[PDB]
C-alpha cells in the first residue's frame, strides 16, 4: 500500500525518504541537492503533500526551502526544535554556504493522519530534543537515533546519552522485531538485529 524510496545526499550522506501511496507522496528530511529531489518528485507524478523532519540538524533540512518554494507544502516537526531552523549554532551548520525560513507545523507523539497518510509518531529525543520517529505499517523512519550497528552522537546541542538509550530501548525497541528501520545515515536495520548493539548501555 506504500512505497518508500530514498536518495543519499549532501555533505554527510543523509538519507532523504520518499513515501508514496496510490495517489500522493510525502518527503522526509530533504537534506540538500534539491534539484535531484525535485527530479525524483517529478518522476513519481503524484502530488507532494507534506514534508516531515525527523529533526532539524542542518544536514536534514538543507533542501527544505527549495522544495517549499517550488511546491508550497507544510513542514512538520517537533516544536522542541523550531528554533533549530534559523539558528546555525543549534542545528550544527556553524562549524561553506544552512537554514530554513519555513514556519513549521508541530507534531506530537501519537497516531497522525496527514493528507491521507496514516502513521504513528514517537518522540525519541537524546540525539536532539525534537527527534521524531515515524512509524508506518511496513517500515519506520528513525532519524539519527539507531543506526545499523551504531547510535546517534549525543554530544551536540541538548544531546544526552542516557536519554537516547532510553528512547531506543523503551520506544524503538517496542516496534515489530523485523520491521525495516530507515535511519538518517547508513543502511537499514531492525529491532531484532540491534538487540546486542554495543553502544547501548545502562
Ligand atoms: Zn543529527
Ligand atoms: Zn544527520
Residue numbers in the entry: 4 to 98, 104 to 105, 107 to 211
Which of the paper's sentences describe this entry?
Here we identify the bacterial esterases, GloB and FrmB, that activate carboxy ester prodrugs in Staphylococcus aureus. To establish the structural basis for FrmB and GloB substrate specificity and enable future structure-guided prodrug therapeutic design, we solved the three-dimensional structures of both S. aureus FrmB and GloB. FrmB and GloB have distinct ester substrate specificities, which are supported by the structures of their active sites. Additionally, the finding that mutation in either frmB or gloB is sufficient to confer POM-HEX resistance suggests that the two enzymes may work in concert to bioconvert POM-HEX into HEX.
GloB is predicted to be a type II glyoxalase and a member of the large metallo-β-lactamase protein superfamily (INTERPRO IPR001279). SaGloB hydrolyzes S-lactoylglutathione with a specific activity comparable to previously characterized microbial type II glyoxalases, but SaFrmB lacks appreciable glyoxalase activity. We also solved the structure of SaGloB to 1.65 Å, using selenomethionine (SeMet)-substituted GloB, and molecular replacement, using metallo-β-lactamase TTHA1623 from Thermus thermophilus as a search model. Four monomers of SaGloB are observed in the asymmetric unit with each displaying crystallographic symmetry. SaGloB exhibits the classic αβ/βα-fold that defines the metallo-β-lactamases, including glyoxalase II. Also consistent with previously observed GloB structures, SaGloB shows clear electron density for two zinc ions coordinated by six histidines and two aspartates. Density for a water molecule is also visible and appears to be coordinated by the two zinc ions, as observed for human glyoxalase II. On the opposite side of the active site, SaGloB has a 19-amino acid flexible loop, which is partially observed in the electron density. This loop is positioned such that it may cover the active site to sterically hinder substrate access. The GloB active site channel appears moderately wide, explaining why extensively branched substrates are not tolerated.
